[PDB]
């Protein structure tokens, strides 16, 4: 039970924004210029780490 | 030892946009004879047309072009829905007051933007059009009201405000204000009082069947191969396959537990496809030590 | 034009119970075999909804408030209820919204109407069942929005048998958009008009950018006038059996369950009980022994 | 304190033309060291208001 | 001793800004416009987590 629960929690934490405008990387890269997309992607990367 | 992961690479790229022919009526908006007053601003619906970004840059100088939630450069690579255009005219001093979250006469009594606004604001100076030598008085505004407006609301009612107590009840004497005023636009006031033309475009993205989207060409559709797909601006990489699901008419995408798209409606033939990562792996290498062999 | 319709009695408001009714699809995404938690304006479970009858002759159509939204349901048989008016004063001094259904097609207008004392509809010509008279407003001077939907054909049929039409609507007004959700159901009633138990989800229908301030509303009814209705426009009319219920939305948090095909089949109101609070914290519909 | 309670509500007011502060929150907003010009002009000079 | 000390540290850790302009939520919300107040608030939230 402990193993299955831990893995499911890890899989489900992927649908969080961490302050960014979206939880999808491709969508952040679209509709934004690089020097602004870098901040959002930084947020996402730190959260998942 | 564990070294790396093997990974199949994509073969080709495809694109799938809807087929619409006519251009959008951006002419009627930016080239109107006269603009409406800020207290009775206008709103027009733009739908079912191919948008464009070059024609603006091609016509008269349109400075102060600032957007929220999307960069101005990328507007031609996207696919929209529910596009609306609000146009009006103000003095050149108050153009800073058009932003999400602000204070001042216009923001509180004439035109409020929602705090989560996504869209673009355009403003440019117009003296050869709106200012006349004796001063144009057809452009009015509102100065008095009990409480602030909620986002995207208008008030055309005209009645005497009662600043103090003991309402005067339609005699319009002092201790009572007529809530509407007028701008003086003599072509001599200076930069800080010229009449400026403002247009606000609003829309929302990538969550419903779209009708206004930019100029791009469609490619044929290929199934059962690791490819680079792009459906209405939703880029991705993987394998596509015909589905068994059953979408309701107002749905276009489908999501899974991790909140990642894994089904999509093809916007030319109206069929449902399923998206899957193409390959994964782990590689481990067994060696007897380089002191013994190199095999 | 406007006539004064007297000869209808005064009775106190009747109340009934909402057995988990008034839930709608909150988004436009497909989901299946999942439990999803959402926060919005819903109708609380087991609420008291006001109950009106059109059966003296009991013509109740008062001017009701509009706090944050409205759940409107109507059990009927012959299409007596047709539409609604929304506004703040309704006296030509402020804008007001109008939704009507003629015998042909839907009409939506946001104009400075001057609504007179009693709006209604007439004719119901004997043996022909045709609609000809339209008595709602007196003038509509300044306005900006207008819409006439697709043409359809209302049979304008009368009915007195077992009720078979239950239509549910949800009305919301936020950020300049007026949102409508709807659902239909054929029901066997056999019983004293008490809002059958069950579960059913409403689906989005229309979104309108009207942009007005709304505080009150009221219902439009068509009236039955023929030979068995002796009298003029004030007395010579028939009722026809109909009933409708009104409830108000409030900000809640709900837990929803999608089956494998993608339809909402169950729900949990997280502010109803302590046990609902427990389920809504655990994100499950079942709980085991403990604290 | 700059209480204008018996100012905004006075009848004999003809020209209170205030260009950066709405006359309601005069009290809800502060200022700094105050310096008031009291003098007279004629009607042919109310242009100067 | 160990338990008491750990709790004291945890509690007193609530008066740090972690780089934001202030440690009071209402002070951050006012005095700033939303789209940049939110980054300060997220800074505080990450620190406390
Ligand atoms: C219900 O209202 C609609 C909207 O006004 C009516 O349809 C229009 O009627 C006018 C009346 O002359 C015509 O000029 C329009 O051409 C009609 N609109 C169309 C055909 O799209 C409708 O007729 C009304 N119902 C009845 C029974 O008359
Ligand atoms: C939530 C709720 O039911 N509130 C009240 C109920 O307590 C009361 O009994 C009823 C009148 O009968 O009016 C309603
Ligand atoms: C809407 O109308 C009510 C009643 O007239 C009023 O109190 C309220 O302030 C109005 N809404 C706004 C945003 O002013
Ligand atoms: C409203 O109607 C009145 C009377 O017809 C008119 O004087 C006024 O200009 C109108 N207002 C607008 C905003 O059209
Ligand atoms: C779902 O769809 C399948 C296939 O159409 C059908 O057999 C089934 O009855 C539907 N309902 C449920 C609850 O599975």
């Amino acid at each position: 039970n402990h193993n299955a629960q831990a893995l499911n929690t890890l899989v489900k934490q992927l649908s969080s924004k961490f302050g960014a405008i979206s939880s999808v990387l491709n969508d952040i890269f679209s509709r934004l210029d690089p020097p602004e997309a870098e901040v959002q992607i930084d947020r996402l990367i730190t959260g998942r780490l | 030892y564990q070294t790396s992961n093997f990974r199949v690479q994509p073969t080709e790229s495809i694109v799938r946009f809807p087929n619409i022919t006519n251009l959008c009526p951006f002419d009627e908006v930016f080239n109107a004879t006269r603009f409406a007053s800020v207290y009775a601003w206008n709103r027009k619906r733009i739908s079912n047309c191919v948008a464009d970004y070059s024609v603006l840059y091609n016509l008269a100088p349109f400075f102060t072009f600032k957007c929220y939630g999307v960069s101005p450069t990328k507007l031609n690579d996207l696919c929209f829905t529910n596009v609306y255009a609000d146009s009006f005219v103000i003095r050149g001093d108050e153009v800073r007051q058009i932003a999400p979250g602000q204070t001042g006469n216009i923001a509180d009594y004439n035109y409020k933007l929602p705090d989560d606004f996504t869209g673009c604001v355009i403003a440019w100076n117009s003296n050869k059009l709106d200012s006349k030598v004796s001063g144009n008085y057809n452009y009015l505004y509102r100065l008095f009201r009990k409480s602030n407006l909620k986002p995207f609301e208008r008030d055309i009612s005209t009645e005497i405000y009662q600043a103090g107590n003991k309402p005067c009840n339609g005699v319009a004497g002092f201790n009572c204000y007529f809530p509407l005023r007028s701008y003086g636009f003599r072509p001599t006031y200076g930069v800080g009082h010229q009449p400026y033309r403002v247009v606000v475009l609003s829309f929302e993205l990538l969550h419903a069947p779209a009708t206004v989207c930019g100029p791009k060409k469609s490619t044929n559709l290929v199934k059962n191969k690791c490819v680079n797909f792009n459906f209405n601006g939703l880029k991705g990489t993987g394998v596509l396959t015909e589905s068994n699901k059953k979408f309701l008419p107002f749905q276009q995408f489908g999501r899974d537990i991790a909140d990642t798209t894994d089904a999509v409606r093809d916007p030319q033939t109206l069929e449902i496809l399923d998206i899957t990562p193409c390959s994964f792996g782990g590689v481990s290498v067994i060696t007897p030590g380089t002191n013994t062999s190199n095999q | 034009q406007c006539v004064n319709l007297t000869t209808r009695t005064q009775l106190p408001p009747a109340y009934t119970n909402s057995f988990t009714r008034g839930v709608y699809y909150p988004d436009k995404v497909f989901r299946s075999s999942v439990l999803h938690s959402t926060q919005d304006l819903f109708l609380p479970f087991f609420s008291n909804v006001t109950w009106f009858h059109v059966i003296t002759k009991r013509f109740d159509n008062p001017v009701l408030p509009f706090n944050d939204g409205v759940y409107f349901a109507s059990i009927e048989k012959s299409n007596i209820i047709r539409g609604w008016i929304f506004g703040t004063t309704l006296d030509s001094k402020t804008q007001s919204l109008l939704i009507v259904n003629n015998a042909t097609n839907v009409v939506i207008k946001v104009c400075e109407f001057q609504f007179c004392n009693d709006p209604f509809l007439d004719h119901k010509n004997n043996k022909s069942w045709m609609e000809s008279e339209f008595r709602v407003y007196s003038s509509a001077n300044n306005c900006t929005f207008e819409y006439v939907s697709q043409p359809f054909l209302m049979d304008l049929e009368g009915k007195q048998g077992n009720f078979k039409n239950l239509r549910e609507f949800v009305f919301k007004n936020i950020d300049g958009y007026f949102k409508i959700y709807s659902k239909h159901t054929p029901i066997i009633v056999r019983e004293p008009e008490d809002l059958p138990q069950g579960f059913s989800a409403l689906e989005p229908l229309v979104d309108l950018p009207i942009g007005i301030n709304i505080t009150r509303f009221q219902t439009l009814l068509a009236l039955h006038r023929s030979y068995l209705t002796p009298g003029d426009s004030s007395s010579g009319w028939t009722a026809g059996a109909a009933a409708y219920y009104v409830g108000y939305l409030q900000p809640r948090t709900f837990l929803l369950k999608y089956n494998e095909n993608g339809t909402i089949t169950d729900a949990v109101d997280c502010a109803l009980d302590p046990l609902s609070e427990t389920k809504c914290t655990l994100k499950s519909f079942t709980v085991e022994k403990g604290i």
Side-chain angles (χ1 to χ4, degrees), chain A, chain B, chain C:
Chain A
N1 289 0
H2 285 346
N3 188 359
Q5 173 182 109
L7 282 177
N8 278 288
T9 299
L10 192 67
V11 166
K12 185 183 286 185
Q13 293 179 356
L14 280 167
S15 73
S16 296
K17 294 178 172 47
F18 307 112
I21 68 175
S22 179
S23 66
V24 193
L25 284 192
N26 296 298
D27 291 331
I28 287 163
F29 268 116
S30 295
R31 67 193 264 200
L32 294 174
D33 60 336
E36 294 294 328
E38 306 310 9
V39 173
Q40 322 293 323
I41 297 169
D42 186 74
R43 294 199 202 179
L44 283 189
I45 288 175
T46 63
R48 292 175 182 175
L49 277 171
Chain B
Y1 306 90
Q2 303 198 359
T3 71
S4 57
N5 301 54
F6 74 80
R7 185 179 296 113
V8 176
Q9 299 280 106
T11 305
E12 63 188 39
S13 296
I14 63 175
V15 179
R16 291 300 261 176
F17 279 17
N19 47 293
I20 62 170
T21 63
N22 50 297
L23 294 174
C24 292
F26 280 25
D27 211 347
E28 324 191 341
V29 190
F30 295 97
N31 271 349
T33 61
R34 63 181 293 165
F35 270 34
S37 66
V38 67
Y39 64 91
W41 46 271
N42 192 70
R43 173 179 282 264
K44 190 190 208 303
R45 184 176 176 87
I46 296 163
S47 66
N48 196 306
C49 60
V50 181
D52 200 311
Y53 181 76
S54 296
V55 298
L56 285 65
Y57 273 50
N58 189 359
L59 294 174
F62 300 121
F63 292 167
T64 300
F65 185 10
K66 87 175 286 293
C67 296
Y68 301 84
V70 59
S71 80
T73 302
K74 292 210 178 273
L75 287 167
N76 303 273
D77 293 308
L78 269 179
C79 192
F80 291 160
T81 187
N82 290 318
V83 188
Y84 288 112
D86 309 289
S87 66
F88 56 96
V89 72
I90 57 154
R91 67 184 68 188
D93 192 338
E94 295 154 351
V95 76
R96 65 182 294 276
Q97 204 179 119
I98 307 304
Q102 271 287 4
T103 61
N105 201 4
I106 301 299
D108 310 301
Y109 300 133
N110 310 102
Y111 190 83
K112 177 88 83 185
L113 284 194
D115 207 317
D116 56 58
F117 171 69
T118 187
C120 295
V121 178
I122 312 178
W124 68 98
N125 186 327
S126 77
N127 290 318
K128 280 73 176 175
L129 291 143
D130 292 296
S131 44
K132 68 181 178 67
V133 65
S134 179
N136 215 17
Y137 296 177
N138 310 76
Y139 292 156
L140 283 83
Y141 72 96
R142 183 180 295 279
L143 183 62
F144 293 99
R145 207 176 182 279
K146 277 74 69 177
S147 66
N148 301 8
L149 275 300
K150 292 181 181 180
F152 295 131
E153 293 179 353
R154 62 160 69 96
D155 202 9
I156 44 180
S157 296
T158 61
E159 190 277 331
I160 297 89
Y161 169 34
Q162 287 69 60
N165 189 358
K166 182 63 69 177
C168 64
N169 309 80
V171 298
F174 182 76
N175 198 18
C176 295
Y177 293 120
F178 199 72
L180 297 84
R181 297 284 74 78
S182 198
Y183 299 107
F185 279 129
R186 312 254 195 208
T188 300
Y189 279 97
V191 61
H193 287 254
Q194 322 282 10
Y196 274 62
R197 290 247 186 96
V198 176
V199 182
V200 186
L201 285 170
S202 57
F203 63 90
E204 61 86 20
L205 294 174
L206 294 174
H207 294 88
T211 53
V212 172
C213 64
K216 260 172 160 290
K217 293 182 183 293
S218 291
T219 295
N220 187 17
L221 176 70
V222 65
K223 296 174 247 283
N224 305 94
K225 299 169 30 74
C226 191
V227 287
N228 296 57
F229 54 84
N230 181 354
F231 290 87
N232 288 310
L234 183 63
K235 291 174 70 175
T237 300
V239 178
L240 303 153
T241 295
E242 299 137 9
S243 179
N244 189 359
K245 297 178 181 191
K246 296 183 290 294
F247 281 26
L248 289 190
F250 58 96
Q251 293 151 353
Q252 184 178 2
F253 300 95
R255 283 168 146 73
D256 66 348
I257 306 88
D259 189 358
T260 62
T261 302
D262 67 353
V264 64
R265 186 196 279 303
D266 186 74
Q268 303 225 3
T269 79
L270 283 49
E271 63 171 26
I272 297 89
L273 309 173
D274 297 347
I275 309 172
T276 306
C278 64
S279 277
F280 279 71
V283 187
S284 315
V285 54
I286 297 89
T287 183
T290 61
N291 189 359
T292 304
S293 179
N294 282 30
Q295 184 174 354
Chain C
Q1 306 327 311
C2 314
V3 177
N4 293 6
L5 283 72
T6 61
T7 61
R8 65 183 180 179
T9 61
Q10 293 310 52
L11 298 82
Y15 292 68
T16 187
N17 196 28
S18 179
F19 308 100
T20 64
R21 286 261 169 195
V23 65
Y24 49 90
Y25 281 92
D27 60 6
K28 309 204 175 190
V29 171
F30 185 87
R31 310 184 192 268
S32 49
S33 303
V34 65
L35 278 65
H36 194 240
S37 180
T38 180
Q39 179 185 355
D40 189 358
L41 292 83
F42 294 95
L43 184 68
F45 281 0
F46 303 101
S47 305
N48 268 324
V49 304
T50 300
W51 181 5
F52 294 101
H53 295 105
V54 175
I55 301 299
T56 70
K57 299 298 293 295
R58 294 178 65 88
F59 294 3
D60 291 331
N61 51 7
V63 172
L64 303 163
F66 187 108
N67 306 92
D68 290 336
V70 176
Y71 165 86
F72 191 107
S74 87
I75 304 188
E76 80 177 0
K77 293 187 286 185
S78 160
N79 197 307
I80 297 88
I81 296 140
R82 320 271 200 96
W84 315 268
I85 62 170
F86 308 82
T88 304
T89 61
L90 313 191
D91 66 344
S92 179
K93 191 150 163 73
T94 309
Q95 297 195 281
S96 75
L97 187 153
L98 181 71
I99 301 182
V100 192
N101 165 43
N102 271 339
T104 61
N105 64 7
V106 183
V107 174
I108 292 161
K109 291 174 71 175
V110 180
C111 295
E112 293 179 353
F113 290 95
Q114 192 149 241
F115 294 110
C116 64
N117 189 358
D118 187 308
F120 58 98
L121 294 95
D122 293 328
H123 214 251
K124 93 96 182 180
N125 160 209
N126 197 19
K127 300 294 187 291
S128 178
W129 293 91
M130 314 162 311
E131 182 65 26
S132 188
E133 300 157 69
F134 187 90
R135 294 161 190 257
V136 178
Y137 63 96
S138 44
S139 66
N141 200 38
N142 293 337
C143 55
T144 55
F145 193 97
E146 190 277 331
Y147 182 76
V148 179
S149 66
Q150 85 286 9
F152 48 68
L153 188 153
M154 298 289 116
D155 292 338
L156 277 296
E157 69 275 16
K159 186 180 289 293
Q160 294 301 356
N162 180 359
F163 307 172
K164 299 298 293 295
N165 282 186
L166 173 64
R167 326 180 208 276
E168 313 194 42
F169 302 87
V170 163
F171 304 134
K172 298 196 325 176
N173 180 37
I174 62 170
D175 291 331
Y177 296 92
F178 193 81
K179 301 178 175 174
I180 310 192
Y181 305 78
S182 296
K183 187 56 156 270
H184 294 89
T185 308
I187 62 170
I188 297 169
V189 56
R190 185 177 65 246
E191 293 179 353
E193 293 83 3
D194 187 17
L195 200 58
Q197 267 154 345
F199 182 76
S200 179
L202 319 187
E203 299 153 32
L205 178 67
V206 174
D207 188 323
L208 308 170
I210 78 180
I212 72 172
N213 186 0
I214 296 173
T215 303
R216 304 192 306 183
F217 85 99
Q218 167 169 20
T219 304
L220 297 84
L221 283 72
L223 323 175
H224 270 307
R225 297 180 181 177
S226 56
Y227 73 106
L228 73 165
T229 82
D232 291 331
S233 179
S234 189
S235 313
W237 40 262
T238 300
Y244 62 95
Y245 319 85
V246 178
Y248 300 105
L249 312 179
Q250 293 183 354
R252 298 292 183 184
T253 304
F254 271 46
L255 187 85
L256 310 157
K257 184 177 180 180
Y258 304 78
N259 59 19
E260 69 275 16
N261 295 11
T263 61
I264 297 169
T265 61
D266 189 358
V268 159
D269 185 4
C270 305
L272 178 68
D273 285 329
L275 172 66
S276 282
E277 184 178 1
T278 290
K279 291 176 184 188
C280 182
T281 301
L282 293 202
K283 293 210 192 325
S284 179
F285 281 61
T286 51
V287 176
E288 293 179 353
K289 191 191 321 180
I291 171 168

